[PDB]
């Protein structure tokens, strides 16, 4: 019961199942295409603080995947490495054949800890995590992915690092990592470009920790 789009010299139509269109010729299987599109193209927020609120954990439901033949370049991809407070892993290792998404502009790598209630992390809106040419219902550990959806039809990076605490819950906190001992408090009003600009002025000017302590920066509210 999965719909197919049909591309005409008019517009994009959705193929029926009850109505047979005699002129909708299919000459080969090469005219059928699976396309992975990103959610960012619909205006969903992409900052880390808001993104992680769309994900959550559950048990009793197995993971599954489907393939793509083509897809979009992502401006914002994510890569998670989350551990439980006791040091154990939250996310499963990716299985053979799963590789990261090939075309990301900024990768938001989040490392940290938090409660992990289930077996797997699932998307709450039912969107898929997009891996190289495979969409998945779950997040795999250490693998870069984009969020998105898959269409079927008839045809005729800069790496930004963050630390996280309380990753799997509602009230969580994040830091932007400049150096091993240098961090900036993260806010939802920051864009990837903003963070890169802060990394250049702080690092270049030497406003970094010299002692063994952690230097934590807070952006002026204005």
């Amino acid at each position: 019961s999965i719909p197919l789009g049909v591309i005409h010299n008019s517009t994009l139509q959705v193929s029926d199942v009850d109505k047979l269109v005699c002129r909708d010729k299919l000459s080969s299987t090469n005219q059928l295409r699976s396309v992975g599109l990103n959610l960012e193209g619909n205006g969903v927020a992409t900052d880390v603080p808001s993104v992680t609120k769309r994900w959550g954990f559950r048990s009793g439901v197995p993971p599954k995947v489907v393939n793509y033949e083509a897809g979009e370049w992502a401006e914002n991809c994510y890569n998670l490495e989350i551990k439980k407070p006791d040091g154990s892993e939250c996310l499963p290792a990716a299985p053979d054949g799963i590789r990261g998404f090939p075309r990301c502009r900024y990768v938001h790598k989040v490392s940290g800890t938090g409660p992990c209630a289930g077996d797997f992390a699932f998307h709450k809106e039912g969107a898929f995590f997009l891996y190289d040419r495979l969409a998945s219902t779950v997040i795999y550990r250490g693998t870069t992915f984009a969020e998105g959806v898959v269409a079927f039809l008839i045809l005729p990076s800069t790496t930004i690092r963050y630390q996280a605490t309380g990753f799997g819950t509602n009230e969580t906190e994040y830091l932007f990592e400049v150096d091993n001992l240098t961090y900036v408090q993260l806010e939802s009003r920051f864009t990837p470009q903003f963070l890169l600009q802060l990394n250049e002025t702080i690092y270049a000017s030497g406003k970094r920790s010299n002692t063994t302590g952690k230097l934590i920066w807070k952006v002026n509210p204005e």
Partner: nanobody, 136 residues
């Protein structure tokens, strides 16, 4: 700029227990983006003794204890209330001491960008010390 002040002391009988507290201000909150906090005690006539310290949540939130208090004292924090606590069980009269809270903090360099603080693995800020007396 950081200050922390101890309370919850006074006279307790041996074989009992008590919980000390230390509430501060001048920092950026003591739970996240902050130094962990320790307890140190000093009996009159004696030097300081490390009890243990609670790490910040960004550093895991665990407690590292000194051997002399293992399995008797617990170091914990009231998150976002900027308050450090010490639960001392199985009290003996040997535990009479002044109990101090201590913090690896203080303000760092500023920039046109924003403000900053440093969180250390040593102590810059000491509280006043609350005397705990354990006696019959």
């Amino acid at each position: 700029e950081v200050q922390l002040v101890e309370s919850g002391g006074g006279l307790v009988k041996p074989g009992g227990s008590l919980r000390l507290s230390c509430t501060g201000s001048g920092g950026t909150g003591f739970t996240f983006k902050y130094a962990g906090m320790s307890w140190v005690r000093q009996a009159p006539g004696k030097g300081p003794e490390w009890i243990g310290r609670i790490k910040s949540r960004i550093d895991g939130g665990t407690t590292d204890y000194a051997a002399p208090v293992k399995d008797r004292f617990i170091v914990s924090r009231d998150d976002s209330r900027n308050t450090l606590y010490l639960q001392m069980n199985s009290l003996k009269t040997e535990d009479t001491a002044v109990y101090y809270c201590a913090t690896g903090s203080g303000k760092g360099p500023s920039a046109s960008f924003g403000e900053s603080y440093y969180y250390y693995d040593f102590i810059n800020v000491w509280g006043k010390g609350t005397t705990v007396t354990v006696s019959s």
